[PDB]
């Protein structure tokens, strides 16, 4: 029975649908749904801010700061994983693409880890990748220049902030595997793949399989999906010997019209990790298999 | 015995190595380059054009026509495929990386097309990705916006001009769908897979299946490696059902510390392929395998 | 939400293990064990008799013929598929190996089909595969000539009997397409891949998908695996289009050290099903999907 | 450069096609073709005997002894391979199943090894499987019992003879990790796949990947196709790191309507190899792969 890496990512910064009622918005309910996640087996949560007011989104070292603090201080330990995936944010414009449209946010290094500064979480996520990305009906460019990544890592070193390494091609797997050679990555690396986000790997069994090859043997690894895919590319990393990861981030629905809480979507995946012949790791247990100290 | 159909990549915009002795620089070369490529047998040539003097890269028109006009004179015929991969090269600032630094040749779909327009070629190779580059030493962006590929694509429906959709990923091969969703890519779709360029996919095998099974039933595909990778991965593709591409723009070398014409390339790729029971698609053949009127 | 077939197969014929303290043996207690899967959502029964004394290998068609009546008269509808691999058992003589030593069990065609001629079930097991085989310490040679084999299809279709064409290689299924080509498959073929069992295919995701994909494209197939790789390989198959089977034949075991009840085993298999957004067939819905007339 | 071992089946079994000019019938023709192959840059030669009449099928010991012989006095080397395949031969009656009809062979390992007692070759081919075949229009059943397998094995170790493990299926792989498991295989061990052969795996590149894959890591592997797929599956071999065989055995053909000889083959299949940046293996090159001592 091998123990499988749940990690709940809470909210995300994909924009607020006000139907689902109790979406995860100020620093207070983020926190709540962390412990939540954490009460029904999560190991992770996987953290973002949210605009308190209009539930927008945010990059607020201040809120960051609030959600760790409120965790940290609720009697219930899970492993915290803060995203770094801002400031990534391109908007070519059209009249003349070598200019950047005001509305985008690309920041420099500094910048964008003086969350982590401030709060040291035992992770924090990595999107190792530039490309064509689309989110609802909006189409930009993620901007991660190897250089930017080269010294995003470094500042994880120094910090002593495991990086999650998110990739979403077979190119930045390589990539990932570069900043491993160049004595970028401490300890046990972190993968994770990120399915059927466009324009990047599709969320099937094949695409997981082949990426999977790719990962160094020494690492730990992940994959997830998005909406419907949710369920299905987390059965069937366990079955591939990932691990994996659920939440509103992710999926707003526990079943066609009806939505979820994190709790409930922890639940499910728990139930089925079980039901076929493993174990969800406690947040002890996955700090040991990721050789985080206690 | 299927008929493969065989490019030859005759020069590229690679550094010129001035230890190879006869690389295709001026016109005139790269005109006899692609003549000499159609004499072993090939049946498309992929032309670049290099500044006549330094062997640098360029995109001038006039370059460009002047190889067309001197390959369409040559008594000799070979479908030709213009690179059109030019003016989306990026160098972000490293003071800013919302800012594209002076070297970067980021243009408009207007000038990206004006050699197509007067050259007008059968086949233009179309490069439907953005992310992270290297060649050699040099690490930079590709910046192709969908909205840019859109642009791009609908004028070569325009021109009556066949895109080639060179491809660096699975998501990438996503997005080639869905252009022909939306009906920006007209007859028979052509896909090619560009491997172990960094930091896009590998040269394998197993890369070369997956993403394969992701290409469209009635579209035309094939691949191609650089270097060492090259004469694997043409009998590789040929093997798979693929199209395939030699060249010095992909590789200087015949064996190891002899430097390759184009027609030598060509004539080992044919080799291999007769010897496995193939053969080579004359320019005519590949027109007909293309749905590209005589 | 696909509806996705499974089969209960309540007791088989490996040993009786008699710490199992309700393990199917009698005629009364296997009817019993349909029905309780049939409650518990099983889309389909897989019947094998045991010797009603011993708990032995049985292939007594009085056996069968109560089974059938018993559920039948039940008030629960179950499809049901009755065993028709027996009769195969060759035991060399290692004396010479030209000659069947007499605990060998192998019959023609007219007596193996008896028991299906009496009981006219929906479904048939049969096993397209001659081969090396291991039942516990127990090692043995399956004896199915193709001869035999095109017989046995040819019965069915007289009978109006559907055959399962149990599965133990690439080269299994190619044999089975061969039967489809020759005539002797009608309707809706059904494929079940056998995983696990010594000397055939192993219980591995790749060996799973390597294999549907030899499958027709217009076929329902199914896939299972024993012991410790019952429910892994059920859920894998659920994620990649497959039909399912669990059953005391297959496991004894819930979990580590506690025995299941074939309920119990369908339950869980059920859970997982819907909890990764689809949904067990009715028995009237497998009818429909297998074209079975209702 | 990795080295390549390359195989010659020079004759084979299969029934003699006397349109074939100069197929290899009699010791001297077959010894003559295994010069032949040696000299076009053959590592291995696989030796069948016929017979020397009629060209039909023969297990003689005196025959082999004299091709051996006549290959040892030759002046050119080469590494000898034997057919021990032979003896395995079941026609079950159709009245009867349970009963060997006369024509079948199958005789005890003492007999099946004399050839090997006296020849004492440095390598020896062992089916290791149970099975149904096909030869041209005729149906049969090798039987190979896996005690059979065992005592052969072990009399291979006894006699300093190196099997190569001829697998039709991953369940004959398995078997094979399991000989190597009791210490039944000395050193390197030998695995070669079968492919096309009816009802074993087909000649596809998925199935060479999917089978190699269980393939011990410490091992030497090959695979060949038969007719037309002995080209592609030579080449694919080569590609994804197997060793290869081409010949008579196999192929009468060098394309369609021409017969071929071993040596035209071999020569062929080097020429692909070197074309993709391999070698092929001297006899010496290919003993220190395999561990065999000079
Ligand atoms: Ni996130
Ligand atoms: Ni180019
Ligand atoms: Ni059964
Ligand atoms: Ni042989």
Same mark, same amino acid.
């Given at each position: 029975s091998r123990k499988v890496i749940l990690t709940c990512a809470v909210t995300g910064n994909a924009p607020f649908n006000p139907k689902h009622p109790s979406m995860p918005i100020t620093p207070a309910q983020i926190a709540?749904?962390?412990?939540?996640?954490?009460?029904?087996?999560?190991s992770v949560a996987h953290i973002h801010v949210r605009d308190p007011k209009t539930g927008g989104?945010?990059?607020?070292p201040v809120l960051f700061k609030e959600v760790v603090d409120r965790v940290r201080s609720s009697g219930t330990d899970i492993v915290l994983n803060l995203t770094?995936?801002?400031?990534?944010?391109l908007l070519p414009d059209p009249e003349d693409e070598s200019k950047a449209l005001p509305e985008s946010d690309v920041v420099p290094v500094?910048?964008?880890?003086?969350? /982590? &500064? %401030?709060? *040291?979480?035992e992770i924090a996520s990595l999107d190792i990748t530039t490309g064509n990305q689309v989110e609802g009906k909006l189409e930009f460019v993620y901007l991660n220049t190897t250089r930017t990544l080269r010294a995003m890592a470094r500042r994880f070193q120094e910090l002593g902030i495991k990086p999650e390494l998110?990739?979403?091609?077979?190119?930045?797997?390589?990539?990932?595997?570069?900043?491993?050679?160049?004595?970028?990555?401490?300890?046990?690396?972190?993968?994770?793949?990120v399915l059927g986000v466009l324009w990047g790997?599709?969320?099937?069994?094949?695409?997981?399989?082949?990426?999977?090859?790719?990962?160094?043997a020494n690492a730990q690894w992940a994959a997830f999906g998005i909406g419907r895919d949710q369920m299905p590319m987390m059965a069937?990393?366990?079955?591939?010997?990932?691990?994996?990861?659920?939440? /509103? &981030? %992710?999926? *707003?629905?526990?079943?066609?019209?009806?939505?979820?809480?994190?709790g409930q979507l922890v639940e499910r995946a728990r139930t089925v990790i079980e039901h076929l012949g493993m174990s969800v790791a406690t947040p002890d247990e996955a700090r040991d298999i990721m050789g985080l100290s206690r």
């Open positions: 709540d749904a962390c412990v939540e996640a954490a009460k029904a087996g999560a989104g945010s990059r607020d770094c995936g801002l400031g990534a944010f500094a910048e964008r880890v003086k969350h /982590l &500064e %401030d709060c *040291l979480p998110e990739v979403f091609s077979p190119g930045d797997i390589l990539f990932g595997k570069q900043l491993i050679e160049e004595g970028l990555i401490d300890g046990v690396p972190l993968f994770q793949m790997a599709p969320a099937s069994t094949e695409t997981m399989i082949y990426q999977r090859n790719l990962i160094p069937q990393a366990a079955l591939l010997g990932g691990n994996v990861r659920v939440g /509103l &981030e %992710d999926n *707003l629905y526990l079943s066609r019209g009806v939505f979820a809480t994190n």
